[PDB]
């Protein structure tokens, strides 16, 4: 629960990317010119009013002041998109000069600043992309072990979504094996963008190849996850870390908004939108209302603010 402040760089020499500071003095860690890399930069509100006064006297950059008691990633994003009237925001830079312990945002991509040069743009969409992420084992499939397409209308809706550029990101928690069968069984991949498996579990991380099935080009479902929280509970959230990682692997570096669609609300750590799939032992053809919901969710920013 804190007041907050943000730089807005005057000359957007690099766009969209934003940073978070532990010190007003961190400018010294940044040195010359590199501030021109970061369109906006958030800092916790000054305790001493003289700091804010000197800031107010500085003309080198624009700035904003606000409250964000809501210590949440997506809520902060929403607030900032309001403040600067911008639908999209870049990645958050980090340094070995360790960030302020705003670790409530822990689960996120962190850019070690120098990768800024590594920031290629990408072809993959001519519009700014929306993204939707999915699961197999109990998400949208029929509950029969031989799953069925709930609706061929959905089957073609898959391709239709390309009209809007909605990117389609399956992460089955189930092993690669059932996906290996599913692929041959139904060319949803022929309608569908990105696939991942093995998400079921988290491993006790501590400091102490699949192509052969049919000559595929598919990912090593590597052990990229970590304990991350090391606490007495049993949650396997969908991971923006891995997700964005794969996105930048696809050179996907920006997005409008991302929705998770799954049967498990718990994994949603404040995703933009969550679609609790209605588990079904029949092809329900319920997709019509799911469509409508998602469309309205998209429209939310037609007003320039999600609400």
């Amino acid at each position: 629960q804190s007041k907050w402040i943000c730089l807005r760089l005057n000359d957007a020499i690099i766009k969209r990317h934003v940073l978070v500071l532990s010190e007003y003095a961190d400018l010294k860690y940044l040195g010359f010119e590199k501030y021109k890399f970061f369109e906006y930069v958030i800092f916790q509100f000054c305790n001493d009013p003289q700091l804010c006064k000197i800031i107010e006297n500085n003309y080198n950059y624009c700035m904003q002041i606000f409250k964000a008691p809501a210590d949440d990633m997506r809520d902060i994003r929403h607030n900032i998109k309001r403040a600067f009237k911008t639908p999209v925001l870049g990645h958050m830079c980090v340094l070995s000069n360790k960030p302020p312990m705003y670790s409530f945002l822990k689960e996120w991509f962190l850019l070690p600043h120098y990768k800024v040069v590594s920031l290629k743009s990408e072809s993959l969409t001519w519009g700014f992309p929306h993204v939707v992420v999915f699961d197999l084992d109990s998400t949208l499939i029929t509950e029969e072990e031989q799953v069925e397409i709930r609706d061929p209308f959905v089957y073609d809706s898959l391709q239709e979504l390309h009209e809007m550029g909605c990117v389609l990101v399956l992460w089955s928690y189930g092993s690669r094996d059932h996906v290996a069968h599913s692929m041959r069984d139904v060319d949803l991949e022929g309608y569908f963008d990105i696939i991942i498996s093995e998400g079921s579990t988290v491993q006790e991380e501590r400091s102490d190849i699949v192509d052969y099935n049919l000559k595929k080009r598919f990912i090593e479902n590597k052990f990229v996850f970590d304990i991350h929280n090391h606490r007495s509970d049993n949650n396997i959230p969908k991971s923006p870390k891995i997700v964005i990682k794969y996105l930048s692997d696809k050179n996907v570096n920006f997005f409008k908004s991302i929705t998770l669609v799954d049967d498990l609300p718990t994994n949603n750590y404040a995703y933009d939108f969550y679609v609790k799939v209605k588990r079904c032992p029949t092809p329900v053809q319920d997709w019509e209302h799911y469509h409508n919901e998602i469309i309205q969710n998209i429209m939310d920013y037609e007003q320039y603010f999600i609400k």
Partner: peptide
């Protein structure tokens, strides 16, 4: 570099010495 700003600090001490003379 994480020392680069310190090299700049060395530049600063240098210039501080220089300008007086």
């Amino acid at each position: 570099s994480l020392e680069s700003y310190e090299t700049l600090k060395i530049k600063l001490a240098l210039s501080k010495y220089m300008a007086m003379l």
